Every structure is written in C-alpha cells, then in structure tokens.
Amino acid sequence: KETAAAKFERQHMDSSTSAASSSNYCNQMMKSRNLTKDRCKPVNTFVHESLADVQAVCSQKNVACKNGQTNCYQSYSTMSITDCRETGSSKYPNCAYKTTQANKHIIVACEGNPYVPVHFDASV
Ligand SMILES: Nc1ncnc2c1ncn2[C@@H]1O[C@H](COP(=O)(O)O)[C@@H](O)[C@H]1O
C-alpha cells in the first residue's frame, strides 16, 4: 500500500499556501486528503513549508517520540502550520473542524532511505 513517507505527505504537507486563508480550510483539506472517508479523523496538522524544509527536520533536534521511540526530531525553526480539530457537534459523515493557524516547531518521526518524516508527533 501507500508508504509511510507518502501517507505523511497526504496527511500533513500543504506547500500550496503560506497559511490557512479561510475558517473552512480544515473542512475542505480533511475531505480532499481522504481523512473523513470512513470516520472523521479528530485531530490533524498541515505544514505550510517546502517538502525540502520539512524533510530537513530529520537532521535537526533528535528527541523522544510520544510512543518512546528515539527517531523523532524537532524543527529548529517555527513553521507555518494549521491545527484541524473536530468540533464538539461534528457527526460523520458531516465532519466539521475548527481551523487554527499558528507558527510552531514541529516534531516528526523519521525513517527509511531517504530518511524522511513518516509520523507527525506534535507541534510545540
Ligand atoms: N515514533 C513513532 N510514532 C508513531 N508512528 C511512527 C513512529 N516512527 C515511525 N512511525 C510510523 O508512522 C506511521 C503513523 O503515523 P501517523 O499516521 O501520523 O500517526 C506508521 O506508518 C509508523 O510506522
């Protein structure tokens, strides 16, 4: 199936805009990236940086992942991100999300050759 590297790009990478234009960004993106197909994915972050800048996080600040693996990395710089979080009234199949625009460091798990992000751990 779709590799972990390609799933990370589908779920977390939106190079196309520098920031969330509208308050309907998350409603639109969560649909177009197949994150509301079977269920409403409750929480998801999109990174508004170049794929090259995000892939470079894999040679920045090595930290533990939430799951306790030690292949996680924190971006040295803050990045333009959008936090999508499902509303309290959201019911599948009519998934609804609050869009929150922010500048924060990202933490990603890196694996493979090439050594690229396969998991979005957190923003800080
Ligand atoms: N430390 C880690 N924590 C979670 N997932 C990881 C980690 N390292 C690698 N992965 C991969 O990340 C994918 C899950 O990421 P996600 O869908 O963003 O939760 C799986 O394909 C795992 O193999």
From Swiss-Prot:
GO terms for molecular function: lyase activity; nucleic acid binding; ribonuclease A activity; RNA nuclease activity. Pancreas. One of its GO terms (cellular component) is extracellular region. The keyword Cytoplasm does not apply. Glycans are attached at residues 1, 7, 34, 37, 41. Coiled coil: none annotated. It is found in: Secreted. It catalyses: an [RNA] containing cytidine + H2O = an [RNA]-3'-cytidine-3'-phosphate + a 5'-hydroxy-ribonucleotide-3'-[RNA]; an [RNA] containing uridine + H2O = an [RNA]-3'-uridine-3'-phosphate + a 5'-hydroxy-ribonucleotide-3'-[RNA]. The active site is at residues 12, 119. It is an enzyme of class 4 (lyase). Its main location: secreted. Keywords: Disulfide bond, Endonuclease, Glycation, Glycoprotein, Hydrolase, Lyase, Nuclease, Secreted, Signal. One of its GO terms (biological process) is defense response to Gram-positive bacterium. Disulfide bonds join 26-84, 40-95, 58-110, 65-72. Substrate binds at residues 7, 10, 41-45, 66, 85. Its EC number is 4.6.1.18. Interacts with and forms tight 1:1 complexes with RNH1. Dimerization of two such complexes may occur. Interaction with RNH1 inhibits this protein. Monomer. Belongs to the pancreatic ribonuclease family. Endonuclease that catalyzes the cleavage of RNA on the 3' side of pyrimidine nucleotides. Acts on single-stranded and double-stranded RNA. This is Ribonuclease pancreatic. It comes from Bos taurus (Bovine). The lineage of its organism: Eukaryota, Metazoa, Chordata, Craniata, Vertebrata.
